[PDB]
Design a binder for this molecule. Sequence first.
Ligand SMILES: CCc1cccc(CC)c1NC(=O)c1ccn2c1CCc1cnc(Nc3ccc(N4CCN(C)CC4)cc3OC)nc1-2
Ligand code: NA
Length: 256
Amino acid sequence: QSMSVKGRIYSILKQIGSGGSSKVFQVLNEKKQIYAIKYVNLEEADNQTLDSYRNEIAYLNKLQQHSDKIIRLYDYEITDQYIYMVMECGNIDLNSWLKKKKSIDPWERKSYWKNMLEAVHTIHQHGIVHSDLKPANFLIVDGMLKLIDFGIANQQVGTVNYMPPEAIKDMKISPKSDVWSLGCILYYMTYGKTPFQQIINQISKLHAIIDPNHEIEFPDIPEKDLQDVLKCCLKRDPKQRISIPELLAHPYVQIQ
Ligand SMILES: CCc1cccc(CC)c1NC(=O)c1ccn2c1CCc1cnc(Nc3ccc(N4CCN(C)CC4)cc3OC)nc1-2
Ligand code: NA
């Protein structure tokens, strides 16, 4: 069927995403251009939730100017009952793309890493720490990764494999928390698994993540600089962990 957003009509092609009280659709407009529309049902949303949604939308809209590695938001319509967000349509998200992948071109890997650093660096410059980065948060669009969201709105889901030690100990969050998560993503793109994927029991997995006696294996590989990045991102002490500005000057992303 169909949808109107700010007095413009969009034909639905198919659903491509879901999240409790939200759906994402591939759609075509009047000019037969393709877009993604994110729909959010507001019926059962408390005031804090509603405010978390408005806040994420405002940052997405603002950070449009600041980096092309953040997904495009062209328009939106917001009422008491719903939100419609007209966004860039991507080819596919990074989690799905990696899951149907035997191995990765080192060049493609390096190029995706750069994109991830750029996007996350950008949000950090505006005071935002995402704190739940996973491959699902990145969208492949025209051979590029774009960050889809900022971790601000309330709510594969609840996965613990990318969660840094300091997030587990809380019961503090800094930009370094996102570096760990990014490091888990790159480690996955390098070795085909997250660093604690072996441990099936979640409580053991949590205990391994915070245990400095538990050594994370970094098997040798051709690219020594890649191995070094992974070691530097996956320091349990956030004050010992490499920062994003430092990762952008690392030989892994700069050399050749
Ligand atoms: C993790 C981020 C997040 C946080 C909170 C709420 C949502 C909404 C569920 C979301 N997810 C999103 O907003 C999503 C999920 C997918 N997309 C978005 C935002 C806009 C968007 C734009 N293009 C796409 N392209 C796209 C992604 C995956 C696929 N898939 C390929 C087919 N396969 C079976 C898996 C899904 C196909 C696509 O386009 C054809 N996806 C999204
Ligand atoms: Na979010």
